[PDB]
């Protein structure tokens, strides 16, 4: 996979070039904002169980056909698989947040997932709805001003939101 | 590519688990070390041409047969001198990549994998490149932990050739 | 035991490698975080009895049936109350171990492995222990990164119960 | 495996006790001396090829029966195995140095090695002589006052020497 | 789905062989037992709503906090009461399926697989469902081997919750 | 796989319904005819070698191009594979007869078999002709009034014929 | 040894689970078939010598070259006739074991495994033993389900020879 | 493995003998008492969770050093392993009860268990004490006269007791 | 197909290496033996019909029942006699293939693989084909190493039937 | 895999025919020229390193885009893979030369190689250019009259050239 | 050790079969070739000291820096010249073993396995040994197939260094 | 494994010596008798089925306790294993005969065979008696002057007998 630093290196090597002063300055800013990034990962991870459960519960409330007999999430085995998928997507979103790059999310989680869901009959549009609920909950947790040094995390939040949006678009 | 961040994620992913505070501490260690690593990368980059030319001349004076003997693997003509300076620039450039990434990934992937095969096939002596790397170590002009970072990755390349 | 240091060695050993700065940076990250971790460990240890007694009371007040229903899984008698206070003390003690070790190793090895099996077999509700852990989080009196450390491992245990 | 911190934790858990204030003070001192420990590991690692090769060369000069035809290190395959063993022992010694505990060296390297060498006919006393040579070279490298902040590493050096001595005793 | 018939076929198929007298006797045993099994299935089905209502009321009476405590996992409002009666109906319906199929297959596949995960994730106590099953055992009104059939599969679910 | 009982259960579960009294009566009739079903499976199994050998012999007599040099069943290795295929299909037909459902035959034998034969060049129309010969022989054996309590097996014979016809249609 | 009881246990054990009614029904089917199986076993045992002698004579009558041709594989002398009558007695004895055990285990383990190898190595024709088995089927004098049991295991051996 | 019938068959085959009329009579008596044997297995299985849990609870109450910190069953991982061993031994005792022979218990559970416990440091004498507690609870459950046709199961109970005793002797 | 040349290539390929002198000697050995092998192949081919007819007659005289017993596995009619002469011609033709290829490959692939299965299924006695092969060995009229080559592959077929 | 002899045998078996006198004559001529075939294989093998290295060097001199940064053969790992491919193709060409049949080259090397290169982005046309350079060098080596008994190898040289051409066409 | 005979046996053993003519032909090829191989081995042995010293001096004349440059890997002193002549004698002696054994086994096991690792570790240039081998090829004085045998194994060693 | 040539080479390498003229002359004698050695292997292989079957038949005639019910070779599975062992030992004896060295027989067949037989209860002395019968038959076949160029194979026969005797001694 790539992190934010490896991604710039990989592009520079393809050109056979040293990194420019501007590229080094940009990566030094990734380091400078690194503590915020660690807070975001810690906060999403520390609330992962409730993020998944609350989003799943709300999804089933809005879409009761998923859990009624004959529904895709009916029986405890399929429900457990559905909950696992929500946790898996959230996990890889936190990986991408630590890395500052979406590659681990794309390569290990999202690539081929639409075709997997189509082969199984999993309603990917319903998965995307669940992912969007996890997004909104995770962002509110990351943005919570209580118990943390006050500062600006808006760019970080937009980055995290893009990872969630990327996951939802890959299954819808 | 091996970096402290990708290594932490790969550890969590192998285990099917979220990142734990062990992995987050590792990444913060990488952030705290970055100031020294980036200082080294900037200095090696800013002085790259002089370091490359000086390293090549160090090799030619340590192994003068490399500029005397006929052969596609030697630097006795302009073609071979260009190949050699090119190679030395590859080492220096990919070393700065490793400093920027905070790990051996770039050296491992771009240079060391397949290194032995290439040196055997094209009859290139590893000792030539060790001498070039020793020159860069002696002439980068760094001190403190920035020198420590530069020397660690230079020594990593030397060990791969030894 | 999973610590940042044993995790660094295990990563190198799996690849048959010497340690690189990818791993040495990880260990220095653990060294830099230790001050916050040890401040949390000392505070939880110094106030352990009061936290344990307060957490047990918090559970009994939230779930009054646990002091009334007479089954072996409940705390209606001195035997069950002693079991419960013992359990909460185990959680708190092993949390301080994880703070000192710099990772989840102690919690993983001593408590979380087999936890689901034990709560099912002995009919113990995970929600009881979640409530005890929330009490500890609300009453350890820490601030800054020391609270961050303590809360990270408390939340880790809560997630293992959820 | 155990590091220095897990070591204290495991002993306390067997007793069912919180760590004492004195135990926390001692572990805090391990952290304070950590930078010197990282230097020692980095210095041994950065010189691994020369530490192995120079010790091997000296061993064969002193013990030519090892490399003469019929000798245990004669043929390139057995010489390669011999050089690999030297590098393995050095590698696990640097692991123990990082951990501040010999467990990784005992459990993954030294346990059963005497019996392995006896089944093969590897002269373990000669291996021990080579290990002693790597020790002397590694200590001189760790102790070198050039290019490092001046300070006292004598306790660390004694600890490192004990790991080398432990490896030599396991095979002699 | 695990039935005595599919188990017999699976055993033959694993060895790439025709069914033998060893397996045909097993299937006749299933055919003979079906008189008791189907009698139990009809009785549970014919009284399904009274059994479900009675079992739910028995759970609330044994664990009245479930009608009192606030939270999505409790039956303290109409939504939670509807979820609970739904769940109990699932248990009873899938128990009749197992009786009809002559094996644990339906319970194994539709209910027990993933059961622990769900009870942990949604904070549902296994003891609630055990009490519902004990009510059904006490009130199905069956006798003889038909009662034995019903109670065996009820006990199978109780063990899966324990 | 499914047997006759599991198939009804699976359909009921998809609808979230208890079995109707008519569905229960239908399955009780499967139980009531179970002894005849066991006789049918026992009779086909006890004559499996002659059912296969006689059908193969007759097929090769009618289609000598299959066994002449260059033919698909020429050489003993290809003949053994052909005889094996006949035995495999008969085996899965007897499984379906015991189950009262074709799922095991469809899932483990017939699905993908046409494509397998097409990739190999096996003449599926000739396999289908062999299967029909096994069918006629097996039905005559099941229907034999000697050595059995006299009674009506016509519904069971129709069911068994349908499984053979299913196999022949899957490869033709 | 394959019996309905040992396959029931093996099925549970492969899956690491207790026996269920899925397997107990199989065993009861074995118990209810035992009446017919034991009737057959007693009749074959009580008439064993007459059945063995008659079957051997039936083989020679169908294949009279076996009493004429010279060779260790033929019954043209006292030694070969004793070998043949011995073999046929083995078949009948092990068939009665299978009837008693309720499954093919004894035939599978004592006779069928390695059967093809032995007949090829010692140049024994499977058709000889098929005729002996056909004689036994035509002369055991059983009726009803006892005859069904005996003929099922006789036909099992015939298929193993074909 | 052997059941009661296979054991007699195996002994007769070693002697090359048909079964005697007395041996056939004895095996017919196993069939006659088979219904009671099925009840005993069903009853132990249907109460397996409480048999294990109650015996473990009583063992730890009598031997608190097993669960105190440093004890063999301290930590949840070791407690889970201990509970699993109790369930494993009960499981194989029920197998032996179904088979009417101890071979499956000896071959797949007991042989080598003492040496396993000695290598691990599991107190085999304490395991034996827990096994005897499961014996007493299981026997009381098997002999419970409620909800079953009344009759004599004394010989079957003695057999079941012998299997429990066999397991306890194998680990003590 | 197994020949000395494909075996040599397979040996090199399994080890991912170029052919060495170790394998080239093997192929030259095959070239030097070819003269004797081809001499035998031509002599058997040019006398094939006489060998086939004589071998079939040899079987019918040794085993008179094969021309009298009326089953489909026997040669009492023109159909069975045609099958038998066809089979014997298959053996002889594929033996000449093995001589020409310098190895057992053709016999292994075209005849021996599946041979045991076919003889069992169609109730054909291996002793019949052994006698036919013994006739061919006794009547090919070869001498010297050509005889050695023919007899080696005839004996190879006899062993496959024994 | 087939050699020249097995190819003719396989064709004759499909027709159920003994080899004709003309077919036997042709195979005898293969044997007659066998010594020259062994020389050709030995000569290519004995020069394999220089054949590969000289062709690779010339390819990169003519096509510098292959080795500039971003190029397919840039980095030592990709260069090593490229040199390996040249050695692999030469190896299977020498196999086909020993066999007198292209089947081993087609089946174990060439079949699927174009698809493999297309998925990877390897420029197959450039591989074909390298193969043609190996062909010219190998043929010059095979057909050098120095150090060998003098004679005509023209038919063998044409056959060898056809194997190289077949490899180049399989990737271009 | 890989010889034509051990390769033949290994081929049969991996398939669990007796040796066939496929392998016996290969061994006869080895016997035929032994005359040329042994002529080469005798000539190289008889002239060994002259060839070894001549080859070493050929290296020194091609690469004069190896007798000038200071360092343990060079031959600028008596110790280094003795090492170099020793190594070349190892090559020649093990080449004669391969000739006598009829295969690459001795070179594979005694010299080539580990060769790359040793040249890298001790900073020995493969080109030095290639030049020594080229000298031996040019000076062994053999003709015909004896020269072909000697050169094939010399070239085998050169390729292993290339 | 070693053949006769590799054995001498291995002994010379341990001494660091070229082969002496006497050693080269001895190996030239192995080559000179090579045709006889190939005949010996061909003759034993070509009669392998009768060698095994006749020896087994004679062994069981002399030792009827082996095949009586309860005997080690009673049941067809154990008889098949017994016949297989005879064939295996003969096979490795023919390997040793081709190699002119016992190493393949020692390493892949006889090493640990006694301990295997003791664990199973196979009577090794009876195996040795069967091996001796195979020896006598194989020697008579090898040394039959009919259909071969007349000469002296006495040294080869003594060598072959030593391999059989070595096998019998390893199990007795
Ligand atoms: C005994 C081994 C020798 C020695 C050790 C020594 N080192 C330092 C100070 C520092 N060492 C480091 C090294 C690292 N920090 C990291 O995170 C990593 C991995 C990437 C490494 C390799 C650092 C950062 C420091 C502090 C900055 C500095 O350069 O001083 C000391 C100083 C005391 C201290 O603990 O800080 C000492 C004594 N000095 C000797 O004289 C011995 C030969």
Author numbering:
A (entry chain L), D (entry chain J), F (entry chain B), H (entry chain D), J (entry chain F), L (entry chain H): 1 to 172
B (entry chain K), C (entry chain I), E (entry chain A), G (entry chain C), I (entry chain E), K (entry chain G): 1 to 162
Per the authors:
C-phycocyanin (CPC), a blue pigment protein, is an indispensable component of giant phycobilisomes, which are light-harvesting antenna complexes in cyanobacteria that transfer energy efficiently to photosystems I and II. These structural analyses unexpectedly revealed the coexistence of conventional hexameric (αβ)6 (TlCPC-6) and novel octameric (αβ)8 (TlCPC-8) states, even though TlCPC-6 and TlCPC-8 possessed the same amino acid sequences; notably, PBPs with C4 or D4 symmetries have not previously been reported.
TlCPC crystallized in the primitive orthorhombic P21212 was further refined and then the hexameric structure (TlCPC-6) with D3 symmetry was determined at a resolution of 1.65 Å, where the asymmetric unit contained a hexamer. In TlCPC-6, the buried surface area between hexamers along the C3 axis, as calculated by the PISA program, was 609 Å2 per hexamer, which indicated weak interactions similar to layered CPCs in the rods of PBS. These values were close to those of the reported CPCs, indicating that the estimated main energy pathways between hexamers were via α84PCB and β82PCB. The dihedral angle of the (αβ) monomer (αGln70–αArg30–βGly70) in TlCPC-6 was approximately 110°, whereas the equivalent angle in TlCPC-8 was approximately 123°.
